[PDB]
Amino acid sequence: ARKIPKGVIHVQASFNNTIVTVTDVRGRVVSWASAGTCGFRGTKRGTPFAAQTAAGNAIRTVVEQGMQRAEVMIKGPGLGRDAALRAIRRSGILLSFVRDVTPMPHNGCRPPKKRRV
RNA sequence: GCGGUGGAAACUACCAAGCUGGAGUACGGUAGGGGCAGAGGGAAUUUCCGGUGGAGCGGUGAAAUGCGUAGAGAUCGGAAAGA
Ligand SMILES: [Mg+2]
Ligand SMILES: [Mg+2]
Ligand SMILES: [Mg+2]
Ligand SMILES: [Mg+2]
Ligand SMILES: [Mg+2]
Ligand SMILES: [Mg+2]
Ligand SMILES: [Mg+2]
Ligand SMILES: [Mg+2]
Ligand SMILES: [Mg+2]
Ligand SMILES: [Mg+2]
Ligand SMILES: [Mg+2]
Ligand SMILES: [Mg+2]
Question: Span of the secretion signal?
Fold first, then answer.
């Protein structure tokens, strides 16, 4: 739909799922792919493999718009933080910068209590 | 045991003067999340207002309630607030 030569890839990795969004430097969203939209449900939705197919599935659409260089943003403690990165590499798209944006509060809102499990 | 009387003068007690090592005062330093009061600061989060986008998000041992086509989550820009 839009052919943008350079932009950014946001990958949020949580413990139950990982979102991979494709955007451009103007701060605008083009197309996204989630581990859940790939036909995965809750348990499997956390594994690095679903993050793999998620990243691959977004980059399908990003090469279809004909884009070349990109920055990678990784947010969150989950597993896909490593796995997704591999996909970004093997999908044959030039890797500019890979940053870790995981929000670190400098103090603040008191987190939920400890699960006694 | 109590009372009277004659002696002794070390220890406690009393009376008079002394002495610093105890306790303080002045002086000069120095470390400190000590206390009270008044200024300022940033992350993060939540909600609200927009632009993109367009099906799931969220969550568990595995699920479901819940939130979502009345456009969620994601992402960029703005405000506001408290801790
Ligand atoms: Mg889990
Ligand atoms: Mg006698
Ligand atoms: Mg005497
Ligand atoms: Mg005296
Ligand atoms: Mg105060
Ligand atoms: Mg600020
Ligand atoms: Mg649209
Ligand atoms: Mg419902
Ligand atoms: Mg409404
Ligand atoms: Mg619209
Ligand atoms: Mg949102
Ligand atoms: Mg404020």
Answer: none
Instruction: Give the method used.
Output: cryo-EM
Nearest to A20 by CA among A87, A114, A109: A87
| Resolution as reported, in Å | 3.4
Name the nt closest to A76 by C-alpha to C1'.
B74
Instruction: Report the C-alpha gap between A35 and A52 in whole angstroms.
Output: 9
End-to-end C-alpha distance for chain A, whole angstroms: 49
List, chain by chain, residues whose CB lies under 7 Å from nucleic acid strand B: A 1, 10, 12, 14-17, 19, 21, 23, 27-32, 34-37, 41-43, 45, 75, 103-110, 117
Number of domains in chain A: 1
Which CATH number does the domain housing residue A68 bear?
3.30.420.80
Of all protein residues, which has its CA closest to the C1' atom of B46? A109
Q: Which domain holds residue A56?
A: 1-117
For the CA of A23 and the C1' of B13, the distance in angstroms is 100
